[PDB]
Design a protein around this ligand. Sequence first.
Ligand SMILES: [Mg+2]
Ligand SMILES: [Mg+2]
Ligand SMILES: [Mg+2]
Ligand SMILES: [Mg+2]
Ligand SMILES: [Mg+2]
Ligand SMILES: [Mg+2]
Ligand SMILES: [Mg+2]
Ligand SMILES: [Mg+2]
Ligand SMILES: [Mg+2]
Ligand SMILES: [Mg+2]
Ligand SMILES: [Mg+2]
Ligand SMILES: [Mg+2]
Ligand SMILES: [Mg+2]
Ligand SMILES: [Mg+2]
Ligand SMILES: [Mg+2]
Ligand SMILES: [Mg+2]
Ligand SMILES: [Mg+2]
Ligand SMILES: [Mg+2]
Ligand SMILES: [Mg+2]
Ligand SMILES: [Mg+2]
Ligand SMILES: [Mg+2]
Ligand SMILES: [Mg+2]
Ligand SMILES: [Mg+2]
Ligand SMILES: [Mg+2]
Ligand SMILES: [Mg+2]
Ligand SMILES: [Mg+2]
Ligand SMILES: [Mg+2]
Ligand SMILES: [Mg+2]
Ligand SMILES: [Mg+2]
Ligand SMILES: [Mg+2]
Ligand SMILES: [Mg+2]
Ligand SMILES: [Mg+2]
Ligand SMILES: [Mg+2]
Lengths: 259, 46, 93
Amino acid sequence: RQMTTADFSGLTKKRPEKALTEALPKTGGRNNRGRITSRFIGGGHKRLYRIIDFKRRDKSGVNAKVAAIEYDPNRSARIALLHYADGEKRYILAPEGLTVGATVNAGPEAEPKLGNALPLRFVPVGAVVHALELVPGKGAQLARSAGTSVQVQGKESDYVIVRLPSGELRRVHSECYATIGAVGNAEHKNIVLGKAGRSRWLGRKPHQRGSAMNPVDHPHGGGEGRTGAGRVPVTPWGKPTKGLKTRRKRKTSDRFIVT
Amino acid sequence: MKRTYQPNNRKRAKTHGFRARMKTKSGRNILARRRAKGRHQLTVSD
Amino acid sequence: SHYDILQAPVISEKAYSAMERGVYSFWVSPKATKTEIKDAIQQAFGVRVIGISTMNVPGKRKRVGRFIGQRNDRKKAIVRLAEGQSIEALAGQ
RNA sequence: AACGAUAAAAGAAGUGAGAAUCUUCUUCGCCGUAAGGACAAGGGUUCCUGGGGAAGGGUCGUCCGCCCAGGGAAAGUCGGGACCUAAGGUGAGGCCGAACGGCGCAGCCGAUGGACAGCAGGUCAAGAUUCCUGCACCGAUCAUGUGGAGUGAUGGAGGGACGCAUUACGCUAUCCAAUGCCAAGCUAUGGCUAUGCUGGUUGGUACGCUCAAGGGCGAUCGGGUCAGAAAAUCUACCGGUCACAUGCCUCAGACGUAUCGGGAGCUUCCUCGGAAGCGAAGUUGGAAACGCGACGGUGCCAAGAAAAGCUUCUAAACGUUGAAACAUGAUUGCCCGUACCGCAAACCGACACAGGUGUCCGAGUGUCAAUGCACUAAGGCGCGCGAGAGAACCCUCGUUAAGGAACUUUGCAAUCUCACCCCGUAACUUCGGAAGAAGGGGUCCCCACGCUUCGCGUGGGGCGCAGUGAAUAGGCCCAGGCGACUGUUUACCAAAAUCACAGCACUCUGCCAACACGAACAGUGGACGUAUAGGGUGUGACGCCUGCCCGGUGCCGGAA
RNA sequence: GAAACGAUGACUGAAUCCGCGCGGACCACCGCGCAAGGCUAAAUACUCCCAGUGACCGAUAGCGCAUAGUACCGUGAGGG
Ligand SMILES: [Mg+2]
Ligand SMILES: [Mg+2]
Ligand SMILES: [Mg+2]
Ligand SMILES: [Mg+2]
Ligand SMILES: [Mg+2]
Ligand SMILES: [Mg+2]
Ligand SMILES: [Mg+2]
Ligand SMILES: [Mg+2]
Ligand SMILES: [Mg+2]
Ligand SMILES: [Mg+2]
Ligand SMILES: [Mg+2]
Ligand SMILES: [Mg+2]
Ligand SMILES: [Mg+2]
Ligand SMILES: [Mg+2]
Ligand SMILES: [Mg+2]
Ligand SMILES: [Mg+2]
Ligand SMILES: [Mg+2]
Ligand SMILES: [Mg+2]
Ligand SMILES: [Mg+2]
Ligand SMILES: [Mg+2]
Ligand SMILES: [Mg+2]
Ligand SMILES: [Mg+2]
Ligand SMILES: [Mg+2]
Ligand SMILES: [Mg+2]
Ligand SMILES: [Mg+2]
Ligand SMILES: [Mg+2]
Ligand SMILES: [Mg+2]
Ligand SMILES: [Mg+2]
Ligand SMILES: [Mg+2]
Ligand SMILES: [Mg+2]
Ligand SMILES: [Mg+2]
Ligand SMILES: [Mg+2]
Ligand SMILES: [Mg+2]
């Protein structure tokens, strides 16, 4: 769903369940000491951080009930505020179809039902999960985003195959946790973003094409009128395919990375 | 015609200060150098 | 100790004209505190103090020469006592 | 040549060796969302008083922000510190490093923010929630009486706690009207004789059964231990019983009574002009905030600091007999700032410079509204050369016959147009716009009747060349080129057709990610993000759309 | 360079007195020396300071200064 109109815009999103409740402050910044390292990003409106439970282990064997499903900035992911029988309230990112006031059990013996958050060896094949723990313990580095999913494929010994959103297949051992279902935030992607400055509500001041800069500034800089040569960034690497990975440990846990 | 100098005591003193020259040794060099230039006068008193 | 801490009494139209209200005005050591001026005004002229207030002050001129000047740089206290009054023989100025 | 804005002066009186320039008087003109007033910065005695006249002052000077001397600055309550924390700074141990040194958990520093006890007046030549007077308030120690028992941690909790837009109700600040009151006197010019004219018309505290919008409020019994390290009577949850109208709670503010103030003026000595005394009434009606009642209501996406004081709970400890708490006096109250300038002759501009400088207040009349515009209160000011002349030329203006763009690179410039109400309004459109299209009418005064109010509607009458009668005040249209658009850019010759822009595409990157800062198997940014994400690159809303060629260059893949 | 010898950063890693290193690729011979442990006046350099002296200055000279790192310029280093 979206808003639609005339007066010069397109497509805002729409949300239920509103609270404004309980976690740490965050503070915007771009440069890191001297010259800005991660480029642009100097704008933005005043976000706060929400501590979110990726690990979800020590709550093992303990059921919970969804309080509400809340909007969080810095996210693109619906978050469900969980409350446990323990009394402990914990923010857990909300998947598609996860209702308000549903009940989500934690722990390994919990059924592959929505949100139930179990390890892979107990997850029946083909099933869809999100928030995938990479190395047992720690937390989920995989599929934390909107509409992003992972599909379990037949395991090995302690190890399982998974199809990540990129399409790449990964070896990930079954000792790792995961959450059942895919994390929607509906379809975030088709938001229109309207006009500029909206891109500025959040990140800041997007691409400055090197081709308008000067020979001193960028490789693309210089000349008379709009043109090209080369094909390359801040430093001469290029737009198109150059494998940027280094030959490494991880690389033996990847089977058919394609796209 | 907003000019360059905007007197601000705290600024002036927090850059340029005796304390501020203590912070570093390029500073401490300045200090000894000046002491040597003959009793000059110094950074905070001005 | 006691007899230190006060340089000289403030002497001027305002001072002496306010001396009549039983209010005494001294210059004191610039580094010194209110309670110190209090303990020192009592035990010097031996009269209990209620009202006390203090001030700092600049100096700063030249007579002549290329020198301009430095500064004088003083502190000034004012006190009003209890119904016990009339400091010293200096109450008749 | 110039004497620093075309806001403007004149006379009299005075002082003096000397006055266009200093003082006093009386007029004039100028500002008045300031050219008035209050702070913060910054500046340092520039303040006040008494002198002075070299130089500074664009002339003059008896004068000054200049020179000399002397005084002036007062705080438990205002602002800062002995309180807290943000970014950042620092940082024992700790991580790196040819040296110097770079990092870094806790902790500490750091207001631009949190917390926190006073108000009303009086006056030095010069100070003012600072002194004085009036009543008041906060904490701290002690003392008397009650109580006659628990107190409550470097620890838990709750709380402090936070956005933008828009908006209902009730106020007050505050302003207006009057045949309300009060007070002073006159009046003439033709009139008025008060119904005229002028001025003032309440501030704090306390009490009070008076009027009062608005504001927010649940409570205990209890269950699990897997929750807050443990604890806990506390907090989260879960469950049970009493919260559908109520209604406990609170008073903004008004009203009353009293009290302390103040109040126009009047009195009185006047030492060249102040000082002391005295003290009138406070009415009805209307307007009203960005302030107050409040942490109100509603909607929105881009999703809106932290920490301490604060409240609640125990651990430890001391005591459970002298506790905590209350109020009753008493005692106690440290440090720093506090003058004066402060949209400017005192700050930054080399200068007494047409420049710049963050916040707050900023009256009245007329004007749909207003911080606009004219005039004007209070207040402040006539810009530190001056006097004549009325040539050329120049600058800034007013009017102009006939003509009307013939000027000229170009209608450059300068006119015209100009507010508000009504009628009316095109191709084209992405159906919003184009559009204030274009065009036409109205506009002042009096009286009558009507409505819903500042007022408007209708009718009639009137006056001038003219009625947004002065000031503020769009000329319009038809075609194209470029970019869609709001926006951004060459501080000091270029504002654009440049740059960015939503949207699109290629490609990279599987997380100690790619990428980037970097002595560095340190740290950090990417990101407390995880492929609907992040980097790079190019195009550049939207609409149809995007062809042929990989030989060479690159990139991806391959193995004899 | 025909590059010995010393010196380390990486990697190997010995003998020991009929033993060991050197003698400028290297070998034999002949000589010279005994590493991988330490300390150590004197002759040597310099002039903030003090003394004496000068075919050195004498006020645009001589230090920048017949005293001033002051006045003055600058945010500052700095200049003067
Ligand atoms: Mg360019
Ligand atoms: Mg280049
Ligand atoms: Mg190029
Ligand atoms: Mg006092
Ligand atoms: Mg003080
Ligand atoms: Mg002339
Ligand atoms: Mg002038
Ligand atoms: Mg003066
Ligand atoms: Mg003179
Ligand atoms: Mg003169
Ligand atoms: Mg009247
Ligand atoms: Mg008369
Ligand atoms: Mg009247
Ligand atoms: Mg003042
Ligand atoms: Mg000026
Ligand atoms: Mg300004
Ligand atoms: Mg106003
Ligand atoms: Mg007005
Ligand atoms: Mg105006
Ligand atoms: Mg003239
Ligand atoms: Mg004509
Ligand atoms: Mg005519
Ligand atoms: Mg004509
Ligand atoms: Mg011609
Ligand atoms: Mg024109
Ligand atoms: Mg006529
Ligand atoms: Mg106009
Ligand atoms: Mg454009
Ligand atoms: Mg320019
Ligand atoms: Mg220009
Ligand atoms: Mg060797
Ligand atoms: Mg001479
Ligand atoms: Mg000389």
